[model samples]
Target: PVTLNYANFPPASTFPCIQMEQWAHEVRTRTRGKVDVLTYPGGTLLGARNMLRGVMSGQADIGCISLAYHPGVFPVMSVFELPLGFTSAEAASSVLWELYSGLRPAELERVKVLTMFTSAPSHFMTVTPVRSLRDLQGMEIRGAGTLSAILEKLGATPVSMPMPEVPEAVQKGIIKGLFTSLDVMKDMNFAEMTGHVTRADQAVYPFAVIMNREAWERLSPDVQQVLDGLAAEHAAWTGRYLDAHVQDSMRWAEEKHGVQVHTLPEEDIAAMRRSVQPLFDAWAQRAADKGADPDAVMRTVDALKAQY
Candidate 1:
C-alpha cells in the first residue's frame, strides 16, 4: 500500500479544490483504505507554485499543477490559458481536459499525468460595475500567467500575484479587481472585497494533476487502472460540478455580498477576443522561433475548440 500526497491552492469551497477533496476520498474508498491518498489543500502542504516541485522531488507522490503559477516549465499547457473566447468554464474545462490527456499525451511527459482539468472561464470580479472595455483602463487588475498578458493587451495594468494573496491585496487596496472564474470569487472570499462579477465569456485556464513518474511506476497495474479510470470519470464530474457550482456560489456571493453580476454584450465580447489576438501571435512566434512545433499544436487546439 502506497500513500499519496496532493495539494492545490484555495480553500475547500473552490471548485477544483472541492472536486479534489472528493477525488481524495474516492481514491481511498476505491482502494479499500489499503492505499492512502491524503489531500493537503488550501496550500497548507505547499503553495500552488511549489506543488510541481514538491511532487518532482518526491515530497508529494502526486499533485495538482497550476500552470499559471509556473509558466516557464509549462509552456505547452498554457494553450488552455489563452483567451480563446470561451463561455462555459464547464464545457471548456471538461472537453480540453479529456483532449489534453487522451489525445495530447506529450504535453505532460515530465511527470506521470493522472488527469487534467481547467478553471471556469475567467470573467471580471471587480470592486465596481465595469460595463465597457474603457472601464478597465488604468485599473489595477490582479492576474496570473497568460491571463495577465490578456489584461495588458486590453489596456489594464496587470499585477501578477498568487491567488492566496489576493484577499489581502484587495483588503489593502493594492488592486481594484481581478480577472478570474466564478470559482475563485467564492473560494478566495472575493465577494467580501468586490461587489461585482462581470461575465466576459473570454477565456479558460486549465490546471493539471500529475504523479511523480518513479512513484507512479511503482504502483501495481490494477491500482493504476483504478486511478486512470477515476481520472477520466472525474473529468466529467468536474465539469458538471463546475457548471452547477458557478451559479450556486454566485448566488451565495450575491446574497451575502450584494454582488451585481453582469455579462458583456456579444459584440463587446468579440471585440475583447480580437483585442487579445496579438498575445496569441507573439506566443506562437516565440514557440516557432524555439522550433517547438507551435503550428501543429495550434491546429490541434483549434480543432478541439468546438469539440466539447
Candidate 2:
C-alpha cells in the first residue's frame, strides 16, 4: 500500500477542502483503503504559500497550491487567474487542468499535478465603502502575491498574510478590509466584523493540487492506473463543487451576517484591469529573465481568454 498525505491551508469548511475530502473518500474506496491518504487542513502540515517547496522537499506527499500566492514559480498557471470575465468555476477549473496538462505540461513537470482550479471571482469585503479607487486608498487590505500587487497599484496598502490571520488582522485594526470569496467571510467570520462587500468579480484566483512525483511514481502500475482516473474525476468534482459552494457560501454570508454585496460597474473592471497591468508586465518580464518566453505565455493566455 502506498500512503499519501494531502494538505490544504483553508479551514475544513471552505469548499476546496470540502471537495477534497470527497476526492479522498473516492480514492480510499477505489483503492480499498490500500492506498492510504490523509488530509491536513488549515495549515496543519504546510502553510499555503510554502506548499510548493514543501512538496519539492517531500514535506507533503500531496497538497493544494494557490497560484495567486506563489509568484514566478507557477507563472504559466496564472492564466486561470486573469480577468477572463469567467462566471462558472466548473468551466474555469476544468479548463485550467486540461490546458496545463495538455499544452503546458512541462510547467508542472516538477510535481504530479492532480488538479488545477479557480475560485469564484473574488469579491471584496470591507468595513467601509470600497466601490472606487478613491474609497480604497490607504485602506489596509489583506491579500497575497498578485492580488497584493494589484491592491498596491490601486493605491491601497496591501498586507500580505496567510488566510488564518485575516480575522485577527481585521479585529486588531491592522487591516480595514479583506479581498476574498463570500464563503471565506462566513468561514472566517469576517461577515460579523465587516458590513460592506464589493462582489467585484474583478478577478479570479487559480488554485492547484499536486502530489510529490516520487510518491506517485512509487505506486504500482495497477494502482497508478486507478489513481490516474480517480484524479481526473476528482478534478472535475472540485470545479463543480466549488461553484456550488460559492453560491451557498454567499447566501450564508448574507443571511447570517447582514453583509451587503455590491458588483463593480463595467467601467470599474476596466479601470482595475488597467491598474493591474503593471503587475502582469512585471511578472512577464521576470519570466523572460528565466528564458521562459513569458511573451509567448502571455499571448497564449490572451488568446485563450475567450475559451470560456
Candidate 3:
C-alpha cells in the first residue's frame, strides 16, 4: 500500500482542515485502499510559514498553504487577495481554480498542485465598534497580504500573523481585531472576543494544496489519475461548504454571543474601494514583472467573475 502524509496548519475544526480530511477520505476510498493518507492537523506536521518549503523538502507528502501568508511567492494567484468585491467563497474559489488551471504560473512549477480554493469575503470583527472607515483610524487589526494593505489604506494598523496565533494576540491586546471571513467567529470562537462585526464584503484569501514533485511522480498512473480528477471537484466542494458554513457561523455568533453586525454607509464603502484601487494596479505590474500577461489575467478574472 502507498502511504501519503498530509499536513495542514489550522485546527481540526476549521474549514481548511475539514476539507483536508474530506480529501484524504475520498483518496483512500477511490484508490480502493491501494493508498493510505495519514493526516496531521493544527500544525503538527508543518506550520503555516513553513508549509511550502516543508513540502518542497519532502517533510510532508502533501501540504496546504495560504497564498497570502507568502508574499510574492504566488504573483498570479495573489490577485484573489485584492478587494475585487467577492461576496461568496464558492464563486471566488471556483474562479481561482479555473484561473490557475489556465495560467499555469511558473511560480508553482516546483510542486504538483492538487486543488485551489478561497475564503469568503473578509470583514472587520472588532473588540470595539467600527461603523465607518473613520472609526478604523489607528485601530490595530490582524491581516495578511493585500488585506493588510487594505487595512492600511483604510487607516487601521495591520498586523501579520498566522491564524492559529490570533487568539492570544487578541487576548493580549496585540491586535484590536481581525479582517477575515466571518466563519472564524465561530470556528475560532472569535465571536466571544469580538462583539462587533463590520461588513466589508471585500477580498478573499486563496489557498492551494500541493504535493512534492517527486512524490507525485512516484505514484502509479491510476492513483495519479484519481488525484488529478478530483482537483476541480474538490475545489467546488470546499467552496460550497464554506459558503454555507459562513451563514451558519453568523447565525451561531448572533444566537450564542450576540455579536453585532454593522454595515458601513454606501459612501464609505465607495471610499473604501477607491482607497484600495492602487493595489490592483500594483499587482498588475508585479504580475508583468513575473512574466505573466497582466491584461490577459485581468480579462480572465473579469470574465470568470461575471460568469460565476
Candidate 4:
C-alpha cells in the first residue's frame, strides 16, 4: 500500500482538475485500495506555470502540466496547438498520445510522463457578435499559448492572462472576448458576460501529466506497473470526458443564459484557415530543427485526426 499527492492548477470544475480527480480515483480502484492518492486542485499545491518543475523537484509526486504554458520547450507537441482544425478533443488527444509515444521528445525526459491530452479546439466567445473576420479586427481577445499567436494572425490583439483574471477583465471590457472551448461559458460563467460564440474551432491546448522520476523510482514494481499501464488508458479517458463535458457545458450555457452560438461564414472561415497555415508550417520547421521528422509528424497527426 502507498499514497501519493497529485497537484493540478485549474479549478475542480475545469477539465484538467476533473481529470486529476478521476485519475486519483482510478488509481485507488485499480490497485484495490492499496494505492491512495490525494489530489489538490485550483493551485492549492502549485501553480500551472510551475507544475513541471515542481514535480521534478518533488513538490508533487505527480502534477499535470499544460505543455502550451512552456513554449519552445515542447516544440514537437506544439504542432497540435496550430490551427489544425481538430473538432474533437478525443480525436486530438488520442493522436497526441501516439505522437509522444512515437517521437519521444527529449524535453520531457527530466520526469516520468504518465499521460498527455488536449483541450478541445477553441472558438471565440465574445461580448459582441463576430460574424466575420472583419468583426474581430483590432479587438482584444483573451487567449493563451499558441492560440494567442493565432489570434494575432487573424487580426485580433491577443491579451494573455490567467483564467482567474479573465472574468473580471471581460466584465470591465479589458478584453472584448476570449478564445477557448465552448465549455468556458458555464465553467467560468462567461455565458452571462459574452453573448456570442463564434465558431473558429481551430486548435487545442495540450497538457501533460508527469511524475517525479525519483519518486517514481522509489515505488514498488507493483505500483510502477499499475502506473505505467494507466498512461494511454487515462489519456483516452480524459479526452472522452472532455468531449462529453463540452456538450454538457454548452447546453447549460444556452438553456440557462441564452448564449447564442454563431457559425462564421464558410468564406471567412476559409480565409482564417489560410491565415493560420503559417503557424503549422512554422511548428513543423521547429520540430525539424529539433531533429524530428517534420513531414512524418504532420502526416501522423492528420492520420490520427482521421483515425479517431
Q: All models: lDDT?
A: 0.78, 0.75, 0.93, 0.85
Q: For each candidate, give its TM-score against the true structure.
A: 0.92, 0.89, 0.98, 0.95
Residue 225 shift from truth in candidate 4, angstroms: 1.8
- Could you tell me the C-alpha RMSD of candidate 4 in Å? 1.5
Better of 2 and 4 by TM-score: 4
Tell me the TM-score of model 1.
0.92
> Using TM-score as the measure, which candidate wins?
3
Best by lDDT: 3
**What does candidate 2's lDDT look like per residue over 154-177, in tens digits?**
788999886777889999999998
Residue 109 local lDDT, model 4? 84
Model 2 CA lDDT for position 303: 60
Candidate 4 segments exceeding 4 Å error: none
For model 3, what is the error of residue 67's alpha carbon versus the real structure, in angstroms, after optimal superposition? 0.2
Q: What lDDT score goes with residue 46 in model 3? A: 95
lDDT-better candidate, 3 vs 4? 3
**How should the candidates be ordered by TM-score, best one leading?**
3, 4, 1, 2
* Candidate 1: clashing pairs of residues: none
Q: What is residue 185's positional error in candidate 1, in angstroms?
A: 2.9
Runs of candidate 1 with Cα error greater than 4 angstroms are 102-107, 263-267
Screening candidate 4 with a backbone cut-off below 3 angstroms (N, C-alpha, C), the clashing residue pairs are none
Model 1 Cα lDDT, one tens digit per residue, 1-308: 77888867677777768778878888888988867878877888867778887888888787887678776555566767787666775567666676676455354676888776777778888997888887888999988888998898888899988778888888898999999877765767788889998877656767788889999899999888889878767876777788778887788898888999787777777787788988877777766655566687778777777576
Worst 10 residues of 3 by lDDT: 83-92
Task: Name every residue pair that clashes in candidate 2.
Answer: none
